[PDB]
Amino acid sequence: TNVLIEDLKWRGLIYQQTDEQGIEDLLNKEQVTLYCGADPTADSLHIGHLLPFLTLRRFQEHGHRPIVLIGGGTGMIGDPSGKSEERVLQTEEQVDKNIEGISKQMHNIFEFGTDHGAVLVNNRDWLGQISLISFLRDYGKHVGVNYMLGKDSIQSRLEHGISYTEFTYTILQAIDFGHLNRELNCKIQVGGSDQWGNITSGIELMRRMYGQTDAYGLTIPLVTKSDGKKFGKSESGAVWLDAEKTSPYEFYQFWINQSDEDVIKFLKYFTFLGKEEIDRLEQSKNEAPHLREAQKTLAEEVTKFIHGEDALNDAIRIS
Amino acid sequence: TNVLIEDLKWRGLIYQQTDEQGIEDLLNKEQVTLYCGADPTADSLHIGHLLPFLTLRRFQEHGHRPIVLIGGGTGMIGDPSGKSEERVLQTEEQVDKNIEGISKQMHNIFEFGTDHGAVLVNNRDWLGQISLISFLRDYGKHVGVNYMLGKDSIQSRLEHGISYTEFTYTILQAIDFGHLNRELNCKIQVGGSDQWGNITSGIELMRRMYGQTDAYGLTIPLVTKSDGKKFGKSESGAVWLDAEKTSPYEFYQFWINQSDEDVIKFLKYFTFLGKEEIDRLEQSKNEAPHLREAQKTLAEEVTKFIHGEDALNDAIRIS
Numbered sequence: 001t002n003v004l005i006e007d008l009k010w011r012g013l014i015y016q017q018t019d020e021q022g023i024e025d026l027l028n029k030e031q032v033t034l035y036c037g038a039d040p041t042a043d044s045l046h047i048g049h050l051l052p053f054l055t056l057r058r059f060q061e062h063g064h065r066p067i068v069l070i071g072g073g074t075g076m077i078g079d080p081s082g083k084s085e086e087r088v089l090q091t092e093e094q095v096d097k098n099i100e101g102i103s104k105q106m107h108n109i110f111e112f113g114t115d116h117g118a119v120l121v122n123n124r125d126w127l128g129q130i131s132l133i134s135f136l137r138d139y140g141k142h143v144g145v146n147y148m149l150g151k152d153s154i155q156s157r158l159e160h161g162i163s164y165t166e167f168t169y170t171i172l173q174a175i176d177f178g179h180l181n182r183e184l185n186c187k188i189q190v191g192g193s194d195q196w197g198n199i200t201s202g203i204e205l206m207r208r209m210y211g212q213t214d215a216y217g218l219t220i221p222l223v224t225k226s227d228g229k230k231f232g233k234s235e236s237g238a239v240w241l242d243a244e245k246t247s248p249y250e251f252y253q254f255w256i257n258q259s260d261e262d263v264i265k266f267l268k269y270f271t272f273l274g275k276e277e278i279d280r281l282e283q284s285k286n287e288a289p290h291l292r293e294a295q296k297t298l299a300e301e302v303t304k305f306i307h308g309e310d311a312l313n314d315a316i317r318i319s
Numbered sequence: 320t321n322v323l324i325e326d327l328k329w330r331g332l333i334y335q336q337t338d339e340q341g342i343e344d345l346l347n348k349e350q351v352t353l354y355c356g357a358d359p360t361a362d363s364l365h366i367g368h369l370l371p372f373l374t375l376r377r378f379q380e381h382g383h384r385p386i387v388l389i390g391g392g393t394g395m396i397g398d399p400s401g402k403s404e405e406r407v408l409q410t411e412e413q414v415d416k417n418i419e420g421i422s423k424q425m426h427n428i429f430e431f432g433t434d435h436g437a438v439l440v441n442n443r444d445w446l447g448q449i450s451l452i453s454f455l456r457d458y459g460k461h462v463g464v465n466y467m468l469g470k471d472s473i474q475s476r477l478e479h480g481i482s483y484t485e486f487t488y489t490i491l492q493a494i495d496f497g498h499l500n501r502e503l504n505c506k507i508q509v510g511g512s513d514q515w516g517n518i519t520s521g522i523e524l525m526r527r528m529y530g531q532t533d534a535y536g537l538t539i540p541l542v543t544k545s546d547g548k549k550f551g552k553s554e555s556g557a558v559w560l561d562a563e564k565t566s567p568y569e570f571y572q573f574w575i576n577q578s579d580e581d582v583i584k585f586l587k588y589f590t591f592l593g594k595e596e597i598d599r600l601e602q603s604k605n606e607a608p609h610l611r612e613a614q615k616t617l618a619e620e621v622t623k624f625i626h627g628e629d630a631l632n633d634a635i636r637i638s
């Protein structure tokens with residue numbers, strides 16, 4: 001038993017684990033409970049969010065469980081990770097409006113509603129309670145400043161000033177992990193490179209609060225185009241997984257006009273084909289580039305997936 | 320948490336449980352490990368085997384696990400359940416040949432190969448070992464004759480004589496359940512009406528051997544045609560889920576020419592639609608019978624499933 005660890009590292013989806021061996025272990029023994037999340041900083045996800053939520057499927061595939069968290073709380077604050085400009089808060093309706101969009105997509109990418117499947121959580125439930133005096137007593141006590149001033153994320157901000165709220169974000173997200181680690185049994189936190197800091201911060205506080213209850217962190221990598229030009233950025237800014245911002249036809253194309261270099265890879269990253277199917281599909285590429293098979297299947301795979309069987313047609317029938 | 324128990328009894332898939340409440344319970348608490356099996360008495364399954372193995376999916380759907388057992392051992396003996404004529408043994412090649420067929424179908428109906436998914440077991444592994452003196456000591460001791468002479472199955476046989484082997488079958492199958500109950504954690508045994516006796520017999524010996532380690536038995540019902548004529552029996556004897564004995568076109572038809580009375584039901588029994596989709600699909604039936612929607616979708620559902628997306632086409636394109 002250890003095939004899942006096998007394809008996630010063939011397909012190259014492993015940027016870093018906190019404790020390699022430890023993760024390798026429980027994955028080949030117990031049925032883990034890994035989760036991922038996103039704040040409602042928009043009313044639609046974008047292909048940058050496609051990789052991480054798929055890796056959650058990869059896991060679910062072999063008996064494991066995935067938990068999808070929507071930032072109904074940490075959303076209103078926003079994650080300075082990466083950013084090198086302070087954010088700007090947003091209207092209670094704005095957030096509570098956005099989550100209606102993001103939730104409509106997840107619900108389609110994953111299967112919510114079972115007796116023991118994935119779960120959709122919103123942190124405004126546990127962060128919506130906890131008070132000012134409280135937060136300071138119960139959590140702040142064992143969350144030292146030298147540590148926070150250590151998070152890579154923060155410096156870009158420390159450099160041209162980081163407001164206190166951007167600064168008290170990591171503690172908001174640590175509280176989360178812990179809550180799930182103690183509430184749904186969560187032990188692994190999957191997320192992009194931009195989440196190393198927050199992930200780790202979650203386990204560091206899990207240890208202080210009570211000798212780290214078997215928690216670990218996994219990071220999916222950074223999808224890199226071949227030419228060195230921003231995966232996910234069209235003139236039409238991003239490439240939105242929302243039909244009416246980025247359509248199946250526009251969607252379709254994006255994957256079929258995708259370069260041959262960064263092609264098989266993307267096949268591994270976003271398709272549920274096997275090493276065989278790809279092997280062959282890598283072949284058609286390597287010697288009969290005219291039929292343009294790679295670029296084609298990829299497309300029709302991710303499109304039927306994201307957008308539909310029929311809309312795939314509709315898209316193709318417009319091609 | 321209790322939706323699965325909800326649709327299995329809406330769709331009517333529950334003929335009987337050994338301990339109703341007890342099953343209701345662990346199903347709304349822990350992720351069960353239910354299994355089902357079939358002896359290689361042929362090299363292809365038939366629609367009579369479609370219901371039970373689907374109900375295993377129903378379960379797997381909500382976090383649970385299914386184990387598919389092939390009778391590589393109890394096969395060579397054959398289950399007198401139902402039968403009212405002694406069986407006839409069969410060639411070691413014959414069995415070892417048949418299982419190649421039956422396994423090719425399961426592998427397509429279920430997903431074998433994961434870190435923690437369903438598992439394919441063959442009992443010739445645990446029954447292939449156990450010796451004559453042994454079997455008598457370790458198992459026979461606490462397997463009283465008055466009990467066996469109680470199994471409904473047996474009397475039909477007791478009436479026109481039951482050979483000892485048909486008689487020592489139930490103990491072969493009890494040993495199984497137990498082995499899985501102690502080996503893979505199995506707690507529920509799903510199978511058709513014709514398996515009540517064997518199922519129960521498995522838990523009765525599990526208790527004697529050691530206070531029944533939390534085992535229960537579930538039975539799917541008997542698919543009944545509307546007219547009262549043998550579901551699954553064509554002139555072409557059965558309706559084989561093997562392409563080259565019962566083809567997608569022949570397959571296709573069988574479901575589209577299926578009567579309107581026993582139609583929505585069969586929709587519930589064999590399709591993964593919702594109560595909604597069916598509601599509507601029950602409607603089209605009830606007032607626009609000309610479009611013949613029920614009979615149609617059913618077909619194309621079960622066909623794409625059993626035989627393929629493309630072969631569905633091929634079938635339709637021959638319709």
Ligand SMILES: N[C@@H](Cc1ccc(O)cc1)C(=O)N[C@H](C(=O)O)[C@H]1[C@H](O)[C@](O)(CO)[C@@H](O)CN1O
Pocket residue numbers: 036037038039040041048049050052069070071074079081123173176177191192193194195198
């Ligand atoms: N603080 C997190 C959100 C979070 C919310 C609650 C938690 O308890 C832990 C983290 C974040 O910044 N997420 C990105 C987002 O937009 O929501 C998102 C990124 O955009 C990403 O590319 C795909 O979602 C990858 O970094 C994974 N991420 O969660």
Ligand SMILES: N[C@@H](Cc1ccc(O)cc1)C(=O)N[C@H](C(=O)O)[C@H]1[C@H](O)[C@](O)(CO)[C@@H](O)CN1O
Pocket residue numbers: 355356357358359360367368369371388389390393398400442492495496510511512513514517
């Ligand atoms: N003794 C069982 C097989 C068995 C094998 C190993 C076990 O440890 C327990 C039982 C039997 O008779 N099965 C049917 C078959 O043909 O294999 C089969 C029936 O045909 C059925 O209709 C669908 O498979 C339903 O009764 C479920 N059944 O298992």
